[PDB]
Structure formats: structure tokens, C-alpha cells
């Protein structure tokens, strides 16, 4: 399975294919979403996303 986390998206973002062949997005700014970590982390370093921890 593909590792994924929850994020808050800071800006508008077009849809994007993931390593699991599923489409993530498109995102309105301020959306919270579970997305594959490879994409999410890159979005965070780009400052287009923030990690959020959902304790289960």
C-alpha cells in the first residue's frame, strides 16, 4: 500500500495523479485531505500544505 497522511492545503491546486494510480484533488484553498505522503511532503516543503495529525 501507498503511505499517505492528512494535510491542510494552503492554495488552490489542480488534480494530480498519485503512485497508486488514483487522482488526488483538485483542491480549493483551505481543504483538508488525505493524500499520498510523497506528494504531501513536497507540497509542505513548497509551503502549499501543512501536516495535520489525526489521532486514531
Amino acid at each position: 500500500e501507498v503511505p499517505k497522511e492528512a494535510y491542510i492545503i494552503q492554495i488552490d491546486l489542480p488534480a494530480v495523479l498519485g503512485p497508486d494510480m488514483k487522482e488526488y484533488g483538485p483542491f480549493m484553498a483551505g481543504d483538508m485531505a488525505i493524500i499520498p505522503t510523497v506528494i504531501g511532503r513536497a507540497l509542505v516543503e513548497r509551503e502549499a500544505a501543512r501536516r495535520v495529525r489525526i489521532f486514531l
Partner: peptide, 14 residues
């Protein structure tokens, strides 16, 4: 959102 995440599912919330 927690309901979805707890089942190991994927959500997008606005």
C-alpha cells in the same frame, strides 16, 4: 473526517 480516516479511507473536506 475521523469516521472516514478510521476505516482507512481517503477524504477531502471543505
Amino acid at each position: 473526517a475521523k469516521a472516514v480516516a478510521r476505516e482507512g479511507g481517503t477524504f477531502q473536506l471543505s
